[PDB]
């Protein structure tokens, strides 16, 4: 009874904004209660309605829907086995929102998604996204790829390199420093797994880009403020690498 009521309320279009936020928070509540029988009967219906709600014109509804999505990912990760590409694609797409709150909520959902999704399957969908998507969806995809690369074996990673590498080499040439930095950090993660077997894949990198990558590899080996500091430091170090 309750679930049908919540779904009907959330099916309302362009009206009843506060009542729909209550319905989303009731879904969040059921998720925090576990409500295992609700998911046994209604997982598909709830997930698909939630993903539609990502397209709502109200930013506070989009952000809240992403918070609910994150909770369902945390509590019911196994059921996403059959919705992997859909959930990755919708979550990445939300990163291009004009409203910072929606982007932040998409980032938080993406962080959780990266730890549950089958890693090889995730890497495979991210590769063409990284090569084709607009900024900052490409950025989000590279950051997700880094997290899933951290979850595969050397043997698996070596098999996936021919698909992974072109996007990282391309992204290292992007005009956005955030994308270049994300690519450097992804390459550091790849190197952490396969070591100097990365070498032949890097032949297209210029001297300055190799120097900068080497600097960050050495840092990883030797050891809000920290993040912002790191982002600016990357720009200064990159500047120095090109002189
Ligand atoms: Cl399950």
JSON list of C-alpha atoms and ligand atoms in Angstrom, two decimals:
[
{"chain": "A", "resi": 1, "resn": "UNK", "atom": "CA", "xyz": [0.00, 0.00, 0.00]},
{"chain": "A", "resi": 2, "resn": "UNK", "atom": "CA", "xyz": [2.66, 2.52, 1.08]},
{"chain": "A", "resi": 3, "resn": "UNK", "atom": "CA", "xyz": [4.97, 1.79, -1.84]},
{"chain": "A", "resi": 4, "resn": "UNK", "atom": "CA", "xyz": [2.20, 2.30, -4.43]},
{"chain": "A", "resi": 5, "resn": "UNK", "atom": "CA", "xyz": [1.27, 5.57, -2.72]},
{"chain": "A", "resi": 6, "resn": "UNK", "atom": "CA", "xyz": [4.87, 6.80, -2.84]},
{"chain": "A", "resi": 7, "resn": "UNK", "atom": "CA", "xyz": [5.27, 5.82, -6.51]},
{"chain": "A", "resi": 8, "resn": "UNK", "atom": "CA", "xyz": [2.02, 7.52, -7.51]},
{"chain": "A", "resi": 9, "resn": "UNK", "atom": "CA", "xyz": [3.06, 10.70, -5.70]},
{"chain": "A", "resi": 10, "resn": "UNK", "atom": "CA", "xyz": [6.46, 10.66, -7.42]},
{"chain": "A", "resi": 11, "resn": "UNK", "atom": "CA", "xyz": [4.74, 10.16, -10.75]},
{"chain": "A", "resi": 12, "resn": "UNK", "atom": "CA", "xyz": [3.21, 13.65, -10.36]},
{"chain": "A", "resi": 13, "resn": "UNK", "atom": "CA", "xyz": [4.63, 16.08, -12.88]},
{"chain": "A", "resi": 14, "resn": "UNK", "atom": "CA", "xyz": [5.40, 19.75, -12.22]},
{"chain": "A", "resi": 15, "resn": "UNK", "atom": "CA", "xyz": [3.26, 20.03, -9.09]},
{"chain": "A", "resi": 16, "resn": "UNK", "atom": "CA", "xyz": [3.39, 19.06, -5.44]},
{"chain": "A", "resi": 17, "resn": "UNK", "atom": "CA", "xyz": [7.13, 19.64, -5.08]},
{"chain": "A", "resi": 18, "resn": "UNK", "atom": "CA", "xyz": [7.22, 19.38, -1.30]},
{"chain": "A", "resi": 19, "resn": "UNK", "atom": "CA", "xyz": [4.96, 16.32, -1.25]},
{"chain": "A", "resi": 20, "resn": "UNK", "atom": "CA", "xyz": [7.27, 14.67, -3.77]},
{"chain": "A", "resi": 21, "resn": "UNK", "atom": "CA", "xyz": [10.30, 15.49, -1.59]},
{"chain": "A", "resi": 22, "resn": "UNK", "atom": "CA", "xyz": [8.46, 13.80, 1.29]},
{"chain": "A", "resi": 23, "resn": "UNK", "atom": "CA", "xyz": [7.84, 10.76, -0.95]},
{"chain": "A", "resi": 24, "resn": "UNK", "atom": "CA", "xyz": [11.57, 10.64, -1.83]},
{"chain": "A", "resi": 25, "resn": "UNK", "atom": "CA", "xyz": [12.46, 10.89, 1.86]},
{"chain": "A", "resi": 26, "resn": "UNK", "atom": "CA", "xyz": [9.98, 8.07, 2.61]},
{"chain": "A", "resi": 27, "resn": "UNK", "atom": "CA", "xyz": [11.86, 5.96, 0.03]},
{"chain": "A", "resi": 28, "resn": "UNK", "atom": "CA", "xyz": [15.09, 6.95, 1.80]},
{"chain": "A", "resi": 29, "resn": "UNK", "atom": "CA", "xyz": [13.54, 5.97, 5.13]},
{"chain": "A", "resi": 30, "resn": "UNK", "atom": "CA", "xyz": [12.51, 2.53, 3.82]},
{"chain": "A", "resi": 31, "resn": "UNK", "atom": "CA", "xyz": [16.05, 2.06, 2.53]},
{"chain": "A", "resi": 32, "resn": "UNK", "atom": "CA", "xyz": [17.56, 2.93, 5.96]},
{"chain": "A", "resi": 33, "resn": "UNK", "atom": "CA", "xyz": [15.06, 0.49, 7.54]},
{"chain": "A", "resi": 34, "resn": "UNK", "atom": "CA", "xyz": [16.42, -2.12, 5.02]},
{"chain": "A", "resi": 35, "resn": "UNK", "atom": "CA", "xyz": [12.85, -3.11, 4.06]},
{"chain": "A", "resi": 36, "resn": "UNK", "atom": "CA", "xyz": [14.06, -6.31, 2.38]},
{"chain": "A", "resi": 37, "resn": "UNK", "atom": "CA", "xyz": [10.55, -7.35, 1.33]},
{"chain": "A", "resi": 38, "resn": "UNK", "atom": "CA", "xyz": [9.94, -4.01, -0.41]},
{"chain": "A", "resi": 39, "resn": "UNK", "atom": "CA", "xyz": [12.99, -4.64, -2.61]},
{"chain": "A", "resi": 40, "resn": "UNK", "atom": "CA", "xyz": [11.98, -8.25, -3.28]},
{"chain": "A", "resi": 41, "resn": "UNK", "atom": "CA", "xyz": [8.74, -6.98, -4.85]},
{"chain": "A", "resi": 42, "resn": "UNK", "atom": "CA", "xyz": [9.48, -3.48, -6.10]},
{"chain": "A", "resi": 43, "resn": "UNK", "atom": "CA", "xyz": [13.19, -2.90, -6.79]},
{"chain": "A", "resi": 44, "resn": "UNK", "atom": "CA", "xyz": [12.78, -2.44, -10.56]},
{"chain": "A", "resi": 45, "resn": "UNK", "atom": "CA", "xyz": [9.73, -0.18, -10.26]},
{"chain": "A", "resi": 46, "resn": "UNK", "atom": "CA", "xyz": [11.40, 2.04, -7.65]},
{"chain": "A", "resi": 47, "resn": "UNK", "atom": "CA", "xyz": [14.80, 2.24, -9.38]},
{"chain": "A", "resi": 48, "resn": "UNK", "atom": "CA", "xyz": [13.37, 3.06, -12.80]},
{"chain": "A", "resi": 49, "resn": "UNK", "atom": "CA", "xyz": [11.10, 5.78, -11.38]},
{"chain": "A", "resi": 50, "resn": "UNK", "atom": "CA", "xyz": [14.01, 7.22, -9.42]},
{"chain": "A", "resi": 51, "resn": "UNK", "atom": "CA", "xyz": [16.18, 7.34, -12.55]},
{"chain": "A", "resi": 52, "resn": "UNK", "atom": "CA", "xyz": [13.36, 9.13, -14.44]},
{"chain": "A", "resi": 53, "resn": "UNK", "atom": "CA", "xyz": [13.25, 11.63, -11.57]},
{"chain": "A", "resi": 54, "resn": "UNK", "atom": "CA", "xyz": [16.85, 12.60, -12.38]},
{"chain": "A", "resi": 55, "resn": "UNK", "atom": "CA", "xyz": [15.31, 14.54, -15.27]},
{"chain": "A", "resi": 56, "resn": "UNK", "atom": "CA", "xyz": [13.00, 16.60, -13.06]},
{"chain": "A", "resi": 57, "resn": "UNK", "atom": "CA", "xyz": [13.13, 20.35, -13.77]},
{"chain": "A", "resi": 58, "resn": "UNK", "atom": "CA", "xyz": [13.51, 21.14, -10.05]},
{"chain": "A", "resi": 59, "resn": "UNK", "atom": "CA", "xyz": [17.17, 20.98, -8.90]},
{"chain": "A", "resi": 60, "resn": "UNK", "atom": "CA", "xyz": [16.21, 20.15, -5.32]},
{"chain": "A", "resi": 61, "resn": "UNK", "atom": "CA", "xyz": [14.29, 17.13, -6.63]},
{"chain": "A", "resi": 62, "resn": "UNK", "atom": "CA", "xyz": [17.21, 16.00, -8.86]},
{"chain": "A", "resi": 63, "resn": "UNK", "atom": "CA", "xyz": [19.67, 16.30, -5.96]},
{"chain": "A", "resi": 64, "resn": "UNK", "atom": "CA", "xyz": [17.42, 14.44, -3.56]},
{"chain": "A", "resi": 65, "resn": "UNK", "atom": "CA", "xyz": [16.80, 11.67, -6.09]},
{"chain": "A", "resi": 66, "resn": "UNK", "atom": "CA", "xyz": [20.57, 11.21, -6.37]},
{"chain": "A", "resi": 67, "resn": "UNK", "atom": "CA", "xyz": [20.82, 10.99, -2.55]},
{"chain": "A", "resi": 68, "resn": "UNK", "atom": "CA", "xyz": [18.14, 8.28, -2.58]},
{"chain": "A", "resi": 69, "resn": "UNK", "atom": "CA", "xyz": [19.97, 6.48, -5.39]},
{"chain": "A", "resi": 70, "resn": "UNK", "atom": "CA", "xyz": [23.16, 6.53, -3.32]},
{"chain": "A", "resi": 71, "resn": "UNK", "atom": "CA", "xyz": [21.30, 4.97, -0.37]},
{"chain": "A", "resi": 72, "resn": "UNK", "atom": "CA", "xyz": [19.84, 2.21, -2.53]},
{"chain": "A", "resi": 73, "resn": "UNK", "atom": "CA", "xyz": [23.34, 1.52, -3.91]},
{"chain": "A", "resi": 74, "resn": "UNK", "atom": "CA", "xyz": [24.65, 1.26, -0.34]},
{"chain": "A", "resi": 75, "resn": "UNK", "atom": "CA", "xyz": [21.89, -1.05, 0.87]},
{"chain": "A", "resi": 76, "resn": "UNK", "atom": "CA", "xyz": [21.02, -3.11, -2.21]},
{"chain": "A", "resi": 77, "resn": "UNK", "atom": "CA", "xyz": [24.20, -3.28, -4.33]},
{"chain": "A", "resi": 78, "resn": "UNK", "atom": "CA", "xyz": [23.70, -6.83, -5.63]},
{"chain": "A", "resi": 79, "resn": "UNK", "atom": "CA", "xyz": [20.49, -5.95, -7.49]},
{"chain": "A", "resi": 80, "resn": "UNK", "atom": "CA", "xyz": [22.35, -3.43, -9.63]},
{"chain": "A", "resi": 81, "resn": "UNK", "atom": "CA", "xyz": [24.01, -6.41, -11.39]},
{"chain": "A", "resi": 82, "resn": "UNK", "atom": "CA", "xyz": [21.36, -6.08, -14.12]},
{"chain": "A", "resi": 83, "resn": "UNK", "atom": "CA", "xyz": [21.32, -2.28, -14.23]},
{"chain": "A", "resi": 84, "resn": "UNK", "atom": "CA", "xyz": [25.03, -1.53, -14.35]},
{"chain": "A", "resi": 85, "resn": "UNK", "atom": "CA", "xyz": [25.36, 0.44, -17.56]},
{"chain": "A", "resi": 86, "resn": "UNK", "atom": "CA", "xyz": [22.09, 2.28, -17.02]},
{"chain": "A", "resi": 87, "resn": "UNK", "atom": "CA", "xyz": [23.10, 3.41, -13.53]},
{"chain": "A", "resi": 88, "resn": "UNK", "atom": "CA", "xyz": [26.62, 4.41, -14.60]},
{"chain": "A", "resi": 89, "resn": "UNK", "atom": "CA", "xyz": [25.33, 6.38, -17.57]},
{"chain": "A", "resi": 90, "resn": "UNK", "atom": "CA", "xyz": [22.63, 8.25, -15.63]},
{"chain": "A", "resi": 91, "resn": "UNK", "atom": "CA", "xyz": [24.95, 9.05, -12.74]},
{"chain": "A", "resi": 92, "resn": "UNK", "atom": "CA", "xyz": [27.71, 10.33, -15.02]},
{"chain": "A", "resi": 93, "resn": "UNK", "atom": "CA", "xyz": [25.20, 12.39, -17.02]},
{"chain": "A", "resi": 94, "resn": "UNK", "atom": "CA", "xyz": [24.06, 14.17, -13.85]},
{"chain": "A", "resi": 95, "resn": "UNK", "atom": "CA", "xyz": [27.58, 15.63, -13.51]},
{"chain": "A", "resi": 96, "resn": "UNK", "atom": "CA", "xyz": [26.81, 18.15, -16.27]},
{"chain": "A", "resi": 97, "resn": "UNK", "atom": "CA", "xyz": [24.04, 19.82, -14.22]},
{"chain": "A", "resi": 98, "resn": "UNK", "atom": "CA", "xyz": [24.09, 23.65, -13.94]},
{"chain": "A", "resi": 99, "resn": "UNK", "atom": "CA", "xyz": [23.36, 23.40, -10.20]},
{"chain": "A", "resi": 100, "resn": "UNK", "atom": "CA", "xyz": [26.28, 22.65, -7.89]},
{"chain": "A", "resi": 101, "resn": "UNK", "atom": "CA", "xyz": [24.15, 20.75, -5.38]},
{"chain": "A", "resi": 102, "resn": "UNK", "atom": "CA", "xyz": [23.06, 18.30, -8.06]},
{"chain": "A", "resi": 103, "resn": "UNK", "atom": "CA", "xyz": [26.64, 17.77, -9.20]},
{"chain": "A", "resi": 104, "resn": "UNK", "atom": "CA", "xyz": [27.81, 17.15, -5.62]},
{"chain": "A", "resi": 105, "resn": "UNK", "atom": "CA", "xyz": [25.05, 14.58, -5.11]},
{"chain": "A", "resi": 106, "resn": "UNK", "atom": "CA", "xyz": [25.99, 12.91, -8.42]},
{"chain": "A", "resi": 107, "resn": "UNK", "atom": "CA", "xyz": [29.64, 12.76, -7.26]},
{"chain": "A", "resi": 108, "resn": "UNK", "atom": "CA", "xyz": [28.61, 11.08, -4.02]},
{"chain": "A", "resi": 109, "resn": "UNK", "atom": "CA", "xyz": [26.47, 8.51, -5.86]},
{"chain": "A", "resi": 110, "resn": "UNK", "atom": "CA", "xyz": [29.35, 7.88, -8.32]},
{"chain": "A", "resi": 111, "resn": "UNK", "atom": "CA", "xyz": [31.77, 7.21, -5.44]},
{"chain": "A", "resi": 112, "resn": "UNK", "atom": "CA", "xyz": [29.51, 4.46, -4.09]},
{"chain": "A", "resi": 113, "resn": "UNK", "atom": "CA", "xyz": [28.78, 3.06, -7.54]},
{"chain": "A", "resi": 114, "resn": "UNK", "atom": "CA", "xyz": [32.54, 2.66, -8.15]},
{"chain": "A", "resi": 115, "resn": "UNK", "atom": "CA", "xyz": [32.91, 0.28, -5.21]},
{"chain": "A", "resi": 116, "resn": "UNK", "atom": "CA", "xyz": [30.07, -2.10, -5.98]},
{"chain": "A", "resi": 117, "resn": "UNK", "atom": "CA", "xyz": [29.80, -2.41, -9.76]},
{"chain": "A", "resi": 118, "resn": "UNK", "atom": "CA", "xyz": [31.50, -5.36, -11.48]},
{"chain": "A", "resi": 119, "resn": "UNK", "atom": "CA", "xyz": [34.87, -3.74, -12.22]},
{"chain": "A", "resi": 120, "resn": "UNK", "atom": "CA", "xyz": [35.65, -5.08, -15.70]},
{"chain": "A", "resi": 121, "resn": "UNK", "atom": "CA", "xyz": [32.10, -4.38, -16.86]},
{"chain": "A", "resi": 122, "resn": "UNK", "atom": "CA", "xyz": [32.37, -0.85, -15.51]},
{"chain": "A", "resi": 123, "resn": "UNK", "atom": "CA", "xyz": [35.75, -0.23, -17.15]},
{"chain": "A", "resi": 124, "resn": "UNK", "atom": "CA", "xyz": [34.36, -1.38, -20.51]},
{"chain": "A", "resi": 125, "resn": "UNK", "atom": "CA", "xyz": [31.47, 1.11, -20.52]},
{"chain": "A", "resi": 126, "resn": "UNK", "atom": "CA", "xyz": [33.68, 3.94, -19.25]},
{"chain": "A", "resi": 127, "resn": "UNK", "atom": "CA", "xyz": [36.19, 3.60, -22.10]},
{"chain": "A", "resi": 128, "resn": "UNK", "atom": "CA", "xyz": [34.01, 4.93, -24.95]},
{"chain": "A", "resi": 129, "resn": "UNK", "atom": "CA", "xyz": [32.45, 7.51, -22.59]},
{"chain": "A", "resi": 130, "resn": "UNK", "atom": "CA", "xyz": [35.89, 8.88, -21.75]},
{"chain": "A", "resi": 131, "resn": "UNK", "atom": "CA", "xyz": [36.70, 9.16, -25.46]},
{"chain": "A", "resi": 132, "resn": "UNK", "atom": "CA", "xyz": [33.44, 10.81, -26.53]},
{"chain": "A", "resi": 133, "resn": "UNK", "atom": "CA", "xyz": [31.57, 12.62, -23.72]},
{"chain": "A", "resi": 134, "resn": "UNK", "atom": "CA", "xyz": [31.47, 16.35, -23.14]},
{"chain": "A", "resi": 135, "resn": "UNK", "atom": "CA", "xyz": [33.22, 17.96, -20.19]},
{"chain": "A", "resi": 136, "resn": "UNK", "atom": "CA", "xyz": [32.68, 17.35, -17.26]},
{"chain": "A", "resi": 137, "resn": "UNK", "atom": "CA", "xyz": [31.07, 13.94, -17.89]},
{"chain": "A", "resi": 138, "resn": "UNK", "atom": "CA", "xyz": [34.41, 12.74, -19.28]},
{"chain": "A", "resi": 139, "resn": "UNK", "atom": "CA", "xyz": [36.11, 13.94, -16.09]},
{"chain": "A", "resi": 140, "resn": "UNK", "atom": "CA", "xyz": [33.66, 12.00, -13.92]},
{"chain": "A", "resi": 141, "resn": "UNK", "atom": "CA", "xyz": [34.18, 8.91, -16.07]},
{"chain": "A", "resi": 142, "resn": "UNK", "atom": "CA", "xyz": [37.97, 9.04, -15.71]},
{"chain": "A", "resi": 143, "resn": "UNK", "atom": "CA", "xyz": [37.69, 9.42, -11.93]},
{"chain": "A", "resi": 144, "resn": "UNK", "atom": "CA", "xyz": [35.33, 6.44, -11.79]},
{"chain": "A", "resi": 145, "resn": "UNK", "atom": "CA", "xyz": [37.70, 4.41, -13.99]},
{"chain": "A", "resi": 146, "resn": "UNK", "atom": "CA", "xyz": [40.54, 5.11, -11.56]},
{"chain": "A", "resi": 147, "resn": "UNK", "atom": "CA", "xyz": [38.53, 3.72, -8.66]},
{"chain": "A", "resi": 148, "resn": "UNK", "atom": "CA", "xyz": [37.51, 0.55, -10.54]},
{"chain": "A", "resi": 149, "resn": "UNK", "atom": "CA", "xyz": [41.06, -0.03, -11.86]},
{"chain": "A", "resi": 150, "resn": "UNK", "atom": "CA", "xyz": [42.09, -0.18, -8.20]},
{"chain": "A", "resi": 151, "resn": "UNK", "atom": "CA", "xyz": [39.76, -3.22, -7.93]},
{"chain": "A", "resi": 152, "resn": "UNK", "atom": "CA", "xyz": [41.17, -5.49, -10.68]},
{"chain": "A", "resi": 153, "resn": "UNK", "atom": "CA", "xyz": [44.12, -7.85, -10.91]},
{"chain": "A", "resi": 154, "resn": "UNK", "atom": "CA", "xyz": [47.25, -7.16, -12.92]},
{"chain": "A", "resi": 155, "resn": "UNK", "atom": "CA", "xyz": [46.26, -9.87, -15.41]},
{"chain": "A", "resi": 156, "resn": "UNK", "atom": "CA", "xyz": [42.82, -8.32, -15.93]},
{"chain": "A", "resi": 157, "resn": "UNK", "atom": "CA", "xyz": [44.21, -4.80, -16.17]},
{"chain": "A", "resi": 158, "resn": "UNK", "atom": "CA", "xyz": [46.79, -5.84, -18.79]},
{"chain": "A", "resi": 159, "resn": "UNK", "atom": "CA", "xyz": [44.00, -7.35, -20.91]},
{"chain": "A", "resi": 160, "resn": "UNK", "atom": "CA", "xyz": [42.01, -4.09, -20.70]},
{"chain": "A", "resi": 161, "resn": "UNK", "atom": "CA", "xyz": [44.90, -1.71, -21.39]},
{"chain": "A", "resi": 162, "resn": "UNK", "atom": "CA", "xyz": [44.41, -1.45, -25.14]},
{"chain": "A", "resi": 163, "resn": "UNK", "atom": "CA", "xyz": [40.88, -0.17, -24.41]},
{"chain": "A", "resi": 164, "resn": "UNK", "atom": "CA", "xyz": [41.82, 2.04, -21.43]},
{"chain": "A", "resi": 165, "resn": "UNK", "atom": "CA", "xyz": [44.94, 3.72, -22.79]},
{"chain": "A", "resi": 166, "resn": "UNK", "atom": "CA", "xyz": [43.59, 5.74, -25.74]},
{"chain": "A", "resi": 167, "resn": "UNK", "atom": "CA", "xyz": [41.17, 7.65, -23.52]},
{"chain": "A", "resi": 168, "resn": "UNK", "atom": "CA", "xyz": [43.92, 8.51, -21.01]},
{"chain": "A", "resi": 169, "resn": "UNK", "atom": "CA", "xyz": [46.38, 9.63, -23.70]},
{"chain": "A", "resi": 170, "resn": "UNK", "atom": "CA", "xyz": [43.62, 11.73, -25.32]},
{"chain": "A", "resi": 171, "resn": "UNK", "atom": "CA", "xyz": [42.55, 13.16, -21.94]},
{"chain": "A", "resi": 172, "resn": "UNK", "atom": "CA", "xyz": [46.11, 14.16, -21.13]},
{"chain": "A", "resi": 173, "resn": "UNK", "atom": "CA", "xyz": [45.77, 16.57, -24.10]},
{"chain": "A", "resi": 174, "resn": "UNK", "atom": "CA", "xyz": [42.43, 18.01, -22.93]},
{"chain": "A", "resi": 175, "resn": "UNK", "atom": "CA", "xyz": [42.28, 21.80, -22.39]},
{"chain": "A", "resi": 176, "resn": "UNK", "atom": "CA", "xyz": [40.80, 21.28, -18.89]},
{"chain": "A", "resi": 177, "resn": "UNK", "atom": "CA", "xyz": [43.47, 20.83, -16.21]},
{"chain": "A", "resi": 178, "resn": "UNK", "atom": "CA", "xyz": [40.96, 18.78, -14.21]},
{"chain": "A", "resi": 179, "resn": "UNK", "atom": "CA", "xyz": [40.80, 16.20, -17.01]},
{"chain": "A", "resi": 180, "resn": "UNK", "atom": "CA", "xyz": [44.58, 16.18, -17.46]},
{"chain": "A", "resi": 181, "resn": "UNK", "atom": "CA", "xyz": [45.10, 15.72, -13.71]},
{"chain": "A", "resi": 182, "resn": "UNK", "atom": "CA", "xyz": [42.49, 12.94, -13.58]},
{"chain": "A", "resi": 183, "resn": "UNK", "atom": "CA", "xyz": [44.33, 11.18, -16.40]},
{"chain": "A", "resi": 184, "resn": "UNK", "atom": "CA", "xyz": [47.67, 11.49, -14.64]},
{"chain": "A", "resi": 185, "resn": "UNK", "atom": "CA", "xyz": [46.13, 10.08, -11.45]},
{"chain": "A", "resi": 186, "resn": "UNK", "atom": "CA", "xyz": [44.57, 7.22, -13.45]},
{"chain": "A", "resi": 187, "resn": "UNK", "atom": "CA", "xyz": [47.97, 6.43, -15.00]},
{"chain": "A", "resi": 188, "resn": "UNK", "atom": "CA", "xyz": [49.52, 6.45, -11.52]},
{"chain": "A", "resi": 189, "resn": "UNK", "atom": "CA", "xyz": [46.89, 3.90, -10.45]},
{"chain": "A", "resi": 190, "resn": "UNK", "atom": "CA", "xyz": [47.59, 1.75, -13.52]},
{"chain": "A", "resi": 191, "resn": "UNK", "atom": "CA", "xyz": [51.32, 1.90, -12.77]},
{"chain": "A", "resi": 192, "resn": "UNK", "atom": "CA", "xyz": [50.63, 0.88, -9.17]},
{"chain": "A", "resi": 193, "resn": "UNK", "atom": "CA", "xyz": [49.24, -2.39, -10.50]},
{"chain": "A", "resi": 194, "resn": "UNK", "atom": "CA", "xyz": [51.37, -3.24, -13.51]},
{"chain": "A", "resi": 195, "resn": "UNK", "atom": "CA", "xyz": [54.60, -1.38, -12.77]},
{"chain": "A", "resi": 196, "resn": "UNK", "atom": "CA", "xyz": [57.10, -0.78, -15.56]},
{"chain": "A", "resi": 197, "resn": "UNK", "atom": "CA", "xyz": [54.93, -2.88, -17.89]},
{"chain": "A", "resi": 198, "resn": "UNK", "atom": "CA", "xyz": [53.13, 0.41, -18.46]},
{"chain": "A", "resi": 199, "resn": "UNK", "atom": "CA", "xyz": [56.15, 1.74, -20.40]},
{"chain": "A", "resi": 200, "resn": "UNK", "atom": "CA", "xyz": [55.33, 0.69, -23.98]},
{"chain": "A", "resi": 201, "resn": "UNK", "atom": "CA", "xyz": [51.81, 2.16, -23.67]},
{"chain": "A", "resi": 202, "resn": "UNK", "atom": "CA", "xyz": [53.24, 5.64, -23.05]},
{"chain": "A", "resi": 203, "resn": "UNK", "atom": "CA", "xyz": [55.19, 6.15, -26.28]},
{"chain": "A", "resi": 204, "resn": "UNK", "atom": "CA", "xyz": [52.80, 8.90, -27.43]},
{"chain": "A", "resi": 205, "resn": "UNK", "atom": "CA", "xyz": [53.48, 11.07, -24.40]},
{"chain": "A", "resi": 206, "resn": "UNK", "atom": "CA", "xyz": [55.68, 14.13, -24.88]},
{"chain": "A", "resi": 207, "resn": "UNK", "atom": "CA", "xyz": [58.74, 14.70, -22.72]},
{"chain": "A", "resi": 208, "resn": "UNK", "atom": "CA", "xyz": [57.01, 17.21, -20.47]},
{"chain": "A", "resi": 209, "resn": "UNK", "atom": "CA", "xyz": [54.04, 14.90, -19.94]},
{"chain": "A", "resi": 210, "resn": "UNK", "atom": "CA", "xyz": [56.34, 11.99, -19.09]},
{"chain": "A", "resi": 211, "resn": "UNK", "atom": "CA", "xyz": [58.23, 14.14, -16.57]},
{"chain": "A", "resi": 212, "resn": "UNK", "atom": "CA", "xyz": [55.00, 15.21, -14.87]},
{"chain": "A", "resi": 213, "resn": "UNK", "atom": "CA", "xyz": [53.68, 11.62, -14.77]},
{"chain": "A", "resi": 214, "resn": "UNK", "atom": "CA", "xyz": [57.00, 10.44, -13.30]},
{"chain": "A", "resi": 215, "resn": "UNK", "atom": "CA", "xyz": [56.76, 13.10, -10.58]},
{"chain": "A", "resi": 216, "resn": "UNK", "atom": "CA", "xyz": [53.35, 11.82, -9.47]},
{"chain": "A", "resi": 217, "resn": "UNK", "atom": "CA", "xyz": [54.39, 8.17, -9.65]},
{"chain": "A", "resi": 218, "resn": "UNK", "atom": "CA", "xyz": [57.34, 8.99, -7.35]},
{"chain": "A", "resi": 219, "resn": "UNK", "atom": "CA", "xyz": [55.00, 10.83, -4.96]},
{"chain": "A", "resi": 220, "resn": "UNK", "atom": "CA", "xyz": [52.68, 7.82, -4.74]},
{"chain": "A", "resi": 221, "resn": "UNK", "atom": "CA", "xyz": [55.69, 5.64, -3.94]},
{"chain": "A", "resi": 222, "resn": "UNK", "atom": "CA", "xyz": [57.32, 7.91, -1.34]},
{"chain": "A", "resi": 223, "resn": "UNK", "atom": "CA", "xyz": [54.40, 9.82, 0.15]},
{"chain": "A", "resi": 224, "resn": "UNK", "atom": "CA", "xyz": [38.35, 20.49, 1.11]},
{"chain": "A", "resi": 225, "resn": "UNK", "atom": "CA", "xyz": [41.70, 22.20, 1.62]},
{"chain": "A", "resi": 226, "resn": "UNK", "atom": "CA", "xyz": [43.88, 19.27, 0.63]},
{"chain": "A", "resi": 227, "resn": "UNK", "atom": "CA", "xyz": [41.96, 18.71, -2.62]},
{"chain": "A", "resi": 228, "resn": "UNK", "atom": "CA", "xyz": [42.00, 22.37, -3.71]},
{"chain": "A", "resi": 229, "resn": "UNK", "atom": "CA", "xyz": [45.66, 22.61, -2.75]},
{"chain": "A", "resi": 230, "resn": "UNK", "atom": "CA", "xyz": [46.41, 19.48, -4.82]},
{"chain": "A", "resi": 231, "resn": "UNK", "atom": "CA", "xyz": [44.54, 20.84, -7.85]},
{"chain": "A", "resi": 232, "resn": "UNK", "atom": "CA", "xyz": [46.48, 24.12, -7.86]},
{"chain": "A", "resi": 233, "resn": "UNK", "atom": "CA", "xyz": [49.78, 22.38, -7.18]},
{"chain": "A", "resi": 234, "resn": "UNK", "atom": "CA", "xyz": [49.17, 20.18, -10.22]},
{"chain": "A", "resi": 235, "resn": "UNK", "atom": "CA", "xyz": [48.76, 23.26, -12.40]},
{"chain": "A", "resi": 236, "resn": "UNK", "atom": "CA", "xyz": [52.00, 24.81, -11.16]},
{"chain": "A", "resi": 237, "resn": "UNK", "atom": "CA", "xyz": [53.99, 21.57, -11.49]},
{"chain": "A", "resi": 238, "resn": "UNK", "atom": "CA", "xyz": [52.56, 21.03, -14.96]},
{"chain": "A", "resi": 239, "resn": "UNK", "atom": "CA", "xyz": [53.59, 24.57, -15.91]},
{"chain": "A", "resi": 240, "resn": "UNK", "atom": "CA", "xyz": [57.11, 23.84, -14.73]},
{"chain": "A", "resi": 241, "resn": "UNK", "atom": "CA", "xyz": [57.26, 20.56, -16.67]},
{"chain": "A", "resi": 242, "resn": "UNK", "atom": "CA", "xyz": [56.80, 22.42, -19.98]},
{"chain": "A", "resi": 243, "resn": "UNK", "atom": "CA", "xyz": [59.55, 25.00, -19.57]},
{"chain": "B", "resi": 1, "resn": "LIG", "atom": "CL1", "xyz": [19.92, -9.18, -3.47]}
]
